[PDB]
């Protein structure tokens, strides 16, 4: 679990969005596993606007942060799950690091701000949904 809170927006994994997220929907994209809902309170987070390929993510299944080298946002095949059919997920970045399904929502950060959230993983990999291209999150 986990979310990004920036301005009057809450960014979560689309497959973990709540009834309240859908009732306050701003934007969603199944191909990216992202959903953004509106909030009444002002957020605590800053979004990175950069091309970093190194950063630190929070892993809830270890209660620890780990440093990672990650690939640029890309289209990657993701096997079927209870949430989605087998499909290509776009704007996904892969790295070597521990992750389990409940780690989705953990934040990846570089020195500039939030980069993205855990969205895929397994077998010693961890995949992050990028949010740095969503310029409207700042306005
Ligand atoms: N974005 C998706 O389509 C997700 C939906 C939930 C399931 N997905 C995973 O990749 C699982 C694989 C087992 S291990 C694992 C560790 C971390 C995170 C997620 C997973 C795909
Ligand atoms: Zn950066």
Which numbered atom of ligand 1 lies nearest the CA of 87? 3
Q: How far is CA 6 from CA 63, 68, 102, 117, 126, in A?
A: 23, 23, 22, 14, 24
CA distance 76 to 57: 20
Catalytic (active site) residue 59: no
Q: Which token pair is 100?
A: 């389990």
Q: Please, which residues have CB within 8 angstroms of residue 136's CB and are 6 or more apart in sequence? A: none
Instruction: Please tell me whether residues 70 and 127 are part of one structural domain.
Output: yes
44 is in an annotated binding site: no
Please count the structural domains in the chain.
2
Q: Which token pair is 115?
A: 């980069």
Instruction: Please tell me whether residues 109 and 64 are part of one structural domain.
Output: yes
59 is in an annotated binding site: no
Instruction: Please tell me whether residues 55 and 31 are part of one structural domain.
Output: no
Contact 132, 6 (CB under 8 A): no
Instruction: Please tell me whether residues 95 and 54 are part of one structural domain.
Output: yes
In terms of residue numbers, what domain contains 21?
3-44
Instruction: Please tell me whether residues 60 and 40 are part of one structural domain.
Output: no
Write down the residue that tokens 């009732």 correspond to: 23
């Amino acid at each position: 679990s986990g979310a990004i809170y920036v301005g009057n927006y809450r960014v979560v994994n689309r497959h973990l969005a709540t009834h309240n997220d859908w009732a306050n929907l701003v934007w969603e994209d199944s191909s990216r596993d992202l959903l953004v809902s509106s909030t009444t309170a002002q957020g605590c987070d800053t979004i990175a606007r950069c091309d970093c390929q190194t950063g630190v993510y929070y892993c809830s299944s270890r209660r620890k942060h780990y440093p990672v080298s990650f690939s640029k946002p890309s289209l990657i095949f993701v096997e079927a799950s209870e949430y989605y059919p087998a499909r290509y997920q776009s704007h996904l970045m892969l790295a070597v690091g521990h992750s389990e399904p409940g780690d989705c929502g953990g934040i990846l950060r570089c020195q500039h701000g939030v980069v993205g959230i855990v969205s895929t993983g397994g077998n010693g990999l961890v995949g992050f949904a990028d949010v740095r291209d969503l310029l409207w999150l700042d306005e």
